Ligand SMILES: O=c1ccn([C@@H]2O[C@H](COP(=O)(O)OP(=O)(O)O[C@H]3O[C@H](CO)[C@@H](O)[C@H](O)[C@H]3O)[C@@H](O)[C@H]2O)c(=O)[nH]1
C-alpha cells in the first residue's frame with residue numbers, strides 16, 4: 001500500500017494566514033498541520049508516500065518534511081496545477097501508484113482515538129476493494145454522506161445531499177485497490193467543476209466492495225477549516241498531550257514504534273534537538 005496526502009488548495013477562508021502559504025503548513029498546537037495526516041499513513045503501515053500541493057507550496061512541504069529517510073520511509077512530491085478535485089490525486093499520482101494499492105488522506109484532516117491504528121492497519125492490509133471512514137457530524141449536508149444498514153453495510157453515498165440519509169459524514173481518509181486509477185480517469189467533473197471522491201466511492205459501491213469503518217463518538221475528527229476551528233483543534237491537542245506527557249503525531253516516535261527506525265536511530269534524531277522539549281520527548285521515548 002502506498003499513500004498520498006492531498007495538501008493543496010488556496011485556503012481562502014483562513015486569509016491572511018494563507019496569504020502566502022498553504023493551510024497545511026500552519027500549526028496545530030505544537031506541530032505543523034500536515035504532521036497529523038502523515039502520522040496516520042505511517043501508523044497504517046504505509047511507507048511510500050506522495051505529497052501533492054500547489055506550485056508555490058510543494059517545495060515548502062519538501063523543505064519541512066524532506067525525503068523521509070530519517071523516519072525510515074520515502075516521501076515524494078508532486079504539484080497540482082489547480083485544485084480540480086480530490087480524485088485528481090490519482091491522476092497526478094498515476095506514475096507513483098503504478099500497479100499498487102493506495103490510500104489517500106487530506107492534508108488538513110486530524111483523526112484521533114483509541115483503537116484507530118488497528119482500524120488503519122486493517123484497511124491498509126486489504127488486498128481488494130475500498131475502505132472509507134464515517135463519522136457522526138452536526139451538519140452532514142456539508143460533507144460526503146454515507147448511509148448504512150443494521151449490519152453496517154453501505155447502501156448509498158452522496159456528496160453534500162440537500163436531504164442527508166444519515167448523520168455520518170465520509171471523512172477525508174480513503175483506502176483503495178489499484179482499480180482507483182482507472183476509476184478516477186473515467187469519472188467526469190461535477191457541477192462545481194471537480195473530480196469528486198464521492199464518485200470514486202460510488203464506483204466501488206457498484207462493484208460491491210465499498211467497506212465503511214464507522215468511527216464512534218470516542219474518536220475525534222477535527223475541523224481545521226476556519227480560524228475558530230483551527231484554534232479548537234489546537235486546544236484539543238494541547239489538553240490530550242499535557243495531561244499524558246505523550247504526543248499526538250510525533251513522526252519520529254511513530255517511526256520508532258512501527259519499527260521503521262531503530263532505538264539507536266531515534267537517539268540520533270533526539271540528540272541535535274535536546275535544547276527543546278520535542279527533542280527531550282524523543283529521548284525520553286528512547287529510554288522507555
Ligand atoms: O483539488 C483539490 C481539492 C481540494 N483540496 C484540499 O482538500 C481539502 C478538502 O477540500 P474541501 O473543499 O474542504 O472539501 P470538499 O471538497 O468540499 O469535501 C471533500 O472533503 C470532505 C471531508 O472534509 C468530504 O466529506 C467530501 O466528500 C469531499 O468531497 C482542502 O484542504 C482543500 O484545500 C486540494 O488540495 N486539491
Ligand SMILES: O=c1ccn([C@@H]2O[C@H](COP(=O)(O)OP(=O)(O)OP(=O)(O)O)[C@@H](O)[C@H]2O)c(=O)[nH]1
Nearest residue numbers: 112113114115116117118247248249253254257
Ligand atoms: O506513537 C503514537 C501512537 C499512537 N498515536 C495515536 O494515538 C491514538 C491512539 O492510538 P492506538 O490506536 O494505538 O490506541 P491506544 O494507544 O489508546 O491504546 P494501546 O493499544 O496503546 O493500549 C491514535 O489516534 C494514534 O494515531 C500517535 O499519535 N502516536
